[PDB]
Amino acid sequence: MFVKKGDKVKVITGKDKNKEGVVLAAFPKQDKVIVEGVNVVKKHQKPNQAAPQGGILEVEAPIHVSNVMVIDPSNGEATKVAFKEVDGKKVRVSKKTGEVL
Template sequence: MHVKKGDKVMVISGKDKGKTGMILEAYPKQSRVLVEGINIVKKHAKPSQVNPQGGILNQEAPIHVSNVMPVDPKSGKPTRVGYTVENGKKVRVAKNSGEVLDK
């Protein structure tokens, strides 16, 4: 996958198109990512010991990785990802500016 946990990404399609957020979790086997504040769904929780009230909760749902693009640290715009080898390590690079995306 071209994105990792902790990356700042922009949604490029779907109901949240244009919004940005940080990746909270990545699910490589399903090719999905959980992005902070994106794809909010209502979950109906029945009462339990942890949540005695129950009710309807708002939470993020995973979206397909093809619907997000990393944000270029230099310009703040979405960018494609390239790979280069620096000091014997493969690092991700923003195609627009050449800036390294890995910390």
Template sequence: MKIKKGDKVQVITGTYKDTVGEVLACFPKEDRIIVEGVNVVKKHMKPTQENPDGGIVEKEAKIHVSNVMIYDEKAKKAGRVGYKFETDKKGNTEKVRVNKKTGAVIKGKK
């Protein structure tokens, strides 16, 4: 899966089309992700010790990874993810993710 936790993505289909948000969680075995503010559902919660009142809670549900594209904030454009190899000053080669439309390197959280 080319989309990682912490990436900025834009939804390209469905009710939330053109919405930009951050990926909160990834589920590679299911090819699904949770995006901040997208696919918000109401869940009925039973009263528990942590939540004694219970009630109705709004939370984000999973969406398929094919419904989003990586988003470049500087260019304000969404694009597909590609890979390229970069060499640093010491001669070390590293494989990095790249936005194919803008050519910008996608920085991962380390």
């Protein structure tokens, strides 16, 4: 996927539109990604899972990778990504600035 684990992304569609957060986990096979503080769900857990209350946990659920855009760290804005080889090494590049990653 064009996005990676640990990247800073902005949500461009969905209820959490315009939020930003770090990619906690990436699932290329599903083409999905989890962004901290994004797409949070209340899950009714039985106390069987070593939590001696079960309770209603809050956790982020994955969203499709196409619904987020990588935040250009230099500028703080979301941008599309091109691929340019630098010093013989291929890396991502912000199309809006040319900054790397």
